[PDB]
Symmetry: C2
Subunit: 953 residues, 2 copies
């Protein structure tokens, strides 16, 4: 039926053929291994017939890769790049081009995920330790984590930490915090049942000994630098904690929160060399007094020792986190902002304390200069002491000032009260100051104003304490040196530039160059999140197009982009459910059913959304236990708010009767939350919204190619049925309401569409793949997983399978029996894989002592076979131990991983060869050998001796 032109002149390229690893020959061969005639037969045997799409996805014709950037350009060029001096927690900066090119645009940095396998991850672990050290030095607090999502969520994590600490149900918020910070804090509080009160310090009453904590900002949203010593002391005297939202650049010249008693310091690291990104991504910072560390949210790098006593790095105190403690975790956060934390660390390293002081002094002096010019022109400054931010009462019409501002394409903050906020930044030069003085009708140039001329250096607030005294911040100031340091860390880390990283529950698929290109385009990267919307019409088109596509892939009616991780999506989803229930008079329903199979974020998110969790058991086949489910529905039917189902579940299987589960919950007055993170098994085949789900978040960083970034960034947009739409998150600065019916749950992220600048990645993937491609991707994800399962099934037990014996896109290998037979544990297999040139699969989750394997469609048959051959070779190593052919204490498995130092040493007293140690199979060649950089990590020692900043060189 094709036009003749299409026969003579076919498509230039099909991106699916670049994205999807196995071609026709690979797929036939894998199907032959499975004893199947076709892909359709596989799908038919895997995905329940009754949930499958009736018609193919309705998508636009696929866009050739050689046109995708021009296509996207026609959108991005509709944005306008003004000079934004809005402030409000986002400040333009001069992103060092060397960090941008050698880290952000380097696949050796961005394709790896969370550093669960430390011995092949020491580079990003070191960098994240650098980040923590930097945060602790500058804030003056004892320990910092390895990033939070944004400023607002960090402030909410502070509120919740206070609750966890002293269990008081009142939290005081200074109204001079940024508005979006207040909104996110108020939302978190609302659904956790804590009362917030907006009170100036002088209005705050702690005497009731009923205040969990207080949040204030320094400098505050108006720009003012204030002494909070007395406030903090009053808080402490009544058993309350003190939380300070702050600014790393300001703290380069301001005495920090640590020196005035603050228990928690937090903010955004964005202006340390990361783009505005029209809201993100940015790594937020969070630091606390050592006595609070046990309650820390998120990841934290710690120093430990390896097997030989060498000083090395690992994620510390991991039992705090969602994947261990589930609803009892310190937070729901999983994916964070690792890559951007590392960008900010490299910024601090490149500049040192001396360079950062120089930048900060310059910004402050530019602000002082403008300040004097405006006063001479008859305008009033509301605050005399400030860092980079003025609050101005215009001596003339505000309209006339903004008219001139518009003429020079400059944005200010417009306060409610008719005054203007101006926040200067690293990028502000003489020319900009002259424009600004002209805007305010100051006849005097910047040069002239400077002539007649204090601030922070002349004040009691002058910083007198050192920071970044560690060698790491004093060694890499030449561009040659920073490039070498970045490369050194990169080369310590196994990533998708080396080999398949088959992490179950992570979807480590291709992050394509064409998808990634636009995220550093200025029209995406260099827009302030809070500009007037007529400057971001390109973004608006992007959002509409991606929304429409995601709606079609999922069967939902509306998408909300605000949630900036999967866990945030779950939290937003549940909150929307509760707002829906409240609105319709059913607010008493707070019970959330959660299968024990569901991802750990699910119960943590339900706890964060103030729900009562009822676990639901899973049966022996790996499915939701139908008997228990029916019993828990019956038990809770009066109070039932929701179920959270992961589908297919974390056990790797499709439940045969998921519609029936959805019907049962609906019949008893509850809503269905479906965790969409496993949509890599669904896209183009079935849709959660078709089979009875009400709301689902998606992991754009899993299914839709946003890079794993060493542990972030992510995006967790939620798709909802239209009955939930009126209750979707909005934002106090930029309005997200679609209807007059709107009844927003609140605000879950600091920026209205979260990390907007990385959405182009998923838009590009979707537009290049089209309907046919996206389907093929899912088909091949399922094929690849089942092929691997088939190859391995006689060597390892496949723990769970679907009703006809097939898995989804991932499966579990039950390594548990080897404990009794050979004293071999999952960890031994995981470390030994490193010697075979592979990052382990997901280790000891969701079932202790097992491995969860997810190849993705992006890896080809040869690569799958290398991995299966490694596992089969390892099985034979286990059999050697089982059958007494090798020492059961000293063997490759127990001694893994084998470092370069180990294998090149003059001393060799192992009962196996150096070749068995390091080159166990012929595909592991000296010319492609990736070395674990350290011997086996000591997990216990690190937690018993907690060191979470850079140790002396």
């Amino acid at each position: 039926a094709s036009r003749l032109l299409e026969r003579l002149l076919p498509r230039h390229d099909d991106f699916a053929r670049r994205h999807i690893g196995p071609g026709d020959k690979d797929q036939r061969e894998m199907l032959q291994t499975l004893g199947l005639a076709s892909i359709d037969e596989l799908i038919e045997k895997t995905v329940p017939a009754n949930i499958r799409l009736k018609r193919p996805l309705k998508m636009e014709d696929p866009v050739c890769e050689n046109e995708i950037l021009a296509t996207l350009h026609a959108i991005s060029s509709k944005n306008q790049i003004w000079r934004s001096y809005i402030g409000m927690g986002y400040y333009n900066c001069s992103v060092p081009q060397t960090i941008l090119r050698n880290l952000l645009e380097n696949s050796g940095w961005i394709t790896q995920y969370t550093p669960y396998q430390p011995e092949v991850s020491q580079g990003r672990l070191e960098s994240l330790l650098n980040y923590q050290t930097m945060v602790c030095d500058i804030t003056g607090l004892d320990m910092a984590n390895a990033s939070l999502l944004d400023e607002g969520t960090a402030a909410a994590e502070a509120l919740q930490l206070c609750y966890r600490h002293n269990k008081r149900r009142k939290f005081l918020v200074d109204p001079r915090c940024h508005p979006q910070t207040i909104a996110v804090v108020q939302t978190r509080a609302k659904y956790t049942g804590v009362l917030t009160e907006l009170k100036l310090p002088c209005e705050m009453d702690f005497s009731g000994k009923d205040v969990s904590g207080v949040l204030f900002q320094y400098p505050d949203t108006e720009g003012k630098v204030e002494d909070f010593t007395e406030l903090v002391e009053r808080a402490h005297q009544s058993g309350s904690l003190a939380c300070c939202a702050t600014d790393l650049l300001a703290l380069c010249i301001l005495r920090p929160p640590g020196e005035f008693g603050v228990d928690i310091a937090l903010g955004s690291s964005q202006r340390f060399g990361v783009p505005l990104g029209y809201g993100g991504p940015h790594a937020a910072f969070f630091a606390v007094r050592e006595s609070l560390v046990r309650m820390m949210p998120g990841r934290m790098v710690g120093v430990t020792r390896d097997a030989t006593g060498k000083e090395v790095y690992r994620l510390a105190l991991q039992t705090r986190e969602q994947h261990i403690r589930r609803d009892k975790a310190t937070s729901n956060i999983c994916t964070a902002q690792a890559l951007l934390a590392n960008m900010a660390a490299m910024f601090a390293i490149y500049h040192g304390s001396h360079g950062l002081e120089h930048i900060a002094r310059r910004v402050h002096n530019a602000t002082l200069i403008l300040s004097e010019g405006l006063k001479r022109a008859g305008h009033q400054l509301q605050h005399d002491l400030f860092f980079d931010t003025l609050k101005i009462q215009c001596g003339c019409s505000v309209k006339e000032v903004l008219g001139r501002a518009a003429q020079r394409q400059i944005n200010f903050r417009l306060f409610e009260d008719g005054t203007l906020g101006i926040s200067l930044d690293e990028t502000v030069n003489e020319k900009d100051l002259d424009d600004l003085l002209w805007i305010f009708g100051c006849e005097s140039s910047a040069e002239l104003v400077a002539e007649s001329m204090r601030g922070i250096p002349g004040s009691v607030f002058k910083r007198t304490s050192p920071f970044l005294t560690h060698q790491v911040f004093n060694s890499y100031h030449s561009e040659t040196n920073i490039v070498r340091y970045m490369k050194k860390l990169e080369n310590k880390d196994i990533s998708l530039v080396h080999s398949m990283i088959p992490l179950g529950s992570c979807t480590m698929k291709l992050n394509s160059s064409s998808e990634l290109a636009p995220i550093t385009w200025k029209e995406f990267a260099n827009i302030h999140p809070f500009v007037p919307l007529d400057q971001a019409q390109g973004y608006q088109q992007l959002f509409r197009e991606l929304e429409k596509d995601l709606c079609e892939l999922t069967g939902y009616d509306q998408v909300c982009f605000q949630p900036n991780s999967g866990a945030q999506g779950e939290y937003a989803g549940l909150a929307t459910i509760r707002a829906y229930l409240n609105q319709k008079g059913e607010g008493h329903r707070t019970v959330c059913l959660i299968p024990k199979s569901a991802h750990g974020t699910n119960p943590a998110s339900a706890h964060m959304a103030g729900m009562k969790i009822q676990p639901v058991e899973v049966d022996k086949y790996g499915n939701i236990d139908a008997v228990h489910l029916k019993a828990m529905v019956d038990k809770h039917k009066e109070n039932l708010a929701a179920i959270m189902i992961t589908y297919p579940s974390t056990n790797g299987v499709f439940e045969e009767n998921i519609s029936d589960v959805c019907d049962l919950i609906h019949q008893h007055g509850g809503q269905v939350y479906l965790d969409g993170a496993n949509m890599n098994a669904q896209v183009g085949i079935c849709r959660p919204g078709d089979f009875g789900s009400d709301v689902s978040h998606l992991n754009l960083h899993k299914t839709f190619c946003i890079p794993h970034g060493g542990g972030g960034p992510g995006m967790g947009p939620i798709g909802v049925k239209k009955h939930l739409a009126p209750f979707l998150p909005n934002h106090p600065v930029i309005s997200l309401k679609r209807n007059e019916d709107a009844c927003p749950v609140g605000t879950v992220s600091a920026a209205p569409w979260g990390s907007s600048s990385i959405l182009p990645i998923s838009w590009a993937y979707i537009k290049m793949m089209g309907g046919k491609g996206l389907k093929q991707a899912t088909e091949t994800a399922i094929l690849n997983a089942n092929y691997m399962a088939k190859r391995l099934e006689t060597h390892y037990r496949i723990l769970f399978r679907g009703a006809r014996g097939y898995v989804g896109h991932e499966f579990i290998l039950d390594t548990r029996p080897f404990k009794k037979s050979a004293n071999i544990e999952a960890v031994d297999v995981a470390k030994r894989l490193q010697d075979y040139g592979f990052h382990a699969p997901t280790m000891s989750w969701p079932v202790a002592g097992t491995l969860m394997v997810e190849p993705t469609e992006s890896e080809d048959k040869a690569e799958l076979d290398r991995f299966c051959d490694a596992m089969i070779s390892i099985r034979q190593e286990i059999a050697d131990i089982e059958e007494g052919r090798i020492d059961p204490r000293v063997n490759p498995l127990k001694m893994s991983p084998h470092s370069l130092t180990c294998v090149t040493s003059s001393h060799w007293d192992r009962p196996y060869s150096r070749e068995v140690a390091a080159f166990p199979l012929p595909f592991v060649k000296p010319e492609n050998k990736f070395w674990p950089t350290i011997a086996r990590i000591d997990d216990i020692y690190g937690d018993q001796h907690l060191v979470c900043t850079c140790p002396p060189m």
Copy 2:
């Protein structure tokens, strides 16, 4: 100003570019026993040549503003759809190759693969390039690139002369005009006559024709059978040379199949941007019988010390650095990085993907042709690949008016006809615009329906390609984006580069290639402009040229700069040719003698030979300086016939000559011109200027002194600055005029594009604009400090071979390793390979003095890095002392066994009388977590040349 007090400059790029800060410099000065930088300079650079007043430059631009500054220029360019053709064709550069290779410092910072054991990645990739060229052209061996199409065609002409010494060369007038101009220029000054003849006009009967050059498809688009022409050539003892197109040859029977001896062209449309002329790797392939006369580098397969199959540069005695004026060419820096881009293109697509692209382009061209015919236009040629020649049925003006409205360029032929060359980028929408331009009142859809699926054009012709290509596994394995990224990273990681450690190559200036400098070269406003557009579409480039010229004139003391020469050697060639044209014009054409000190770089004599000059070597005195007695004697001898001298200053011996003005005066007084090789300007910039002390003309190496990346052996740019008396004779170009006055008397054309590789000039512009006058001076000062610091630290362990008047070197120096041959049976190569174990690429090995090392750190490396290198050399000296004093076996020791591969050091078998730790981690800074492994044992240089294999082995 007080503003600068309150509001200092945001940043100073010099502090990022220059490795040593204040503490490092003071400490190095203390080591030298000197009080200040000025004292060092005063003691080093002769007072009489130094600047009178400081450089007059613009205020330095902060790094955080350089890209906005450059954007104000680049945005003045206009990006049309250019269907001009003429050897440049838009293509779809795979973004993955662009990001993971062109924008990857692990690919682009290294230079020529002189140290094979730490260079197997780019050597493999260049072997891929060669294999690709040989497969597609059907010839036996190909090089690892040339500069451009036109120079490749000229190399072919010269190869023919070298082969049979006949002094007549026949050129088909249907070659591209720029190809013809470069070929005619080469011929003019080599004393070969060229005759422009159609094949039927070509007379070989005299048996006086060296060779013939024709093109397939030709510049008008025609596909022609040249079998008979080639046979006639061969019958009379002549060679046949064919300029061609790698994409066309995906579906056309290739020149190899119709007897051609040499096939050449541009690899540009295999995944490289237009670049407003470059850079692009030219290809050049020959019959096996001609390989000995091959120009440029060529990768060969050999074995390592263990018998493993590995890669090295082969038959190196052909090249300038060995044979000087007797080399097969002057070429040094080529287009390595861009050859590797084109290889990765072919690998990513395979023969099947390339066939797909080629068939699509051809079918688009067939569609367009059928539409134009139906609209009443005449096609001049029925059989073509991608290029039509159209006699408009209506007014050309009316057509071009519509073309302008859709921002589409055609080629405008002299005879009033239009050339249209379609390319990979052409889609339905473009075809529809083109049909509308020609007033067809059809659509591409409609035209397709009228055509049917009758196979027409090349598939339906006797020219259909039937022979396979790219059958090697390398072209059939890496078609997923995941796989190509992994392959590119695998090769990258085999190669030591500036992302690892200092690469102190004498005569290379391995300085910082900064991210900010590099960013713009892949901006579309620089990368995606056809070199031959109307100039009103390239006004940003015009401002770039003006600004860079003005800066270069100020740095050099010259009056005008010409950007056409696309390597240092090409600059030398252009410079000498200009000198000869100047001499010709004033009636002094008899003067052809060029004096060349033996210290001068090997390119100098090769270039003089290429420019038809008689070379008189001049000796060097025991101190390393031009021998005064011999110089005066050679001047006296050649007085009547003296055309030029070529001086490297400071010379390749690493030293400033005390009386260079006197040398210049002597040559001038005897009627000659002074060519000064500016490649060593990193010891001069901001301190002295060649033009201020008697130089008439210099080339610069922008890829040494001015930060263009070394690219694994290219690209470079070799612009020449001249005094105004030489300016009228500067190169022009037949397509885009470079004449300033009616006074112009151009030497000819030396490069295929008027400003050569335009798209990489922004790098040097950016360096200069960020550094300013003060920064550039500091760079030079610190280059000199760093070299002298190293020399001082090493001088009690190694002999420093040459020093200046007061004992100081310039930016580089020579370590005399020769005595260790007698004392320890240790050779320069042993020291070079042993450095690999210490984590360093060797310095320049056995040049310019056999058995020595030449060391150049540059200003970009800091004291800690210099100290690591000196400590390695001191440790190695002690290893030599252990051999000298019989403390270790003289045959089996780390030095003789170097380099130590991963396989070697991890083997179960170890029977060396030294430890694995001494082998691989000889000093504490060489740590397991930073260890760079030589991927192979020591290369066997003899074996490779005795078993010549120059394509991928099975």
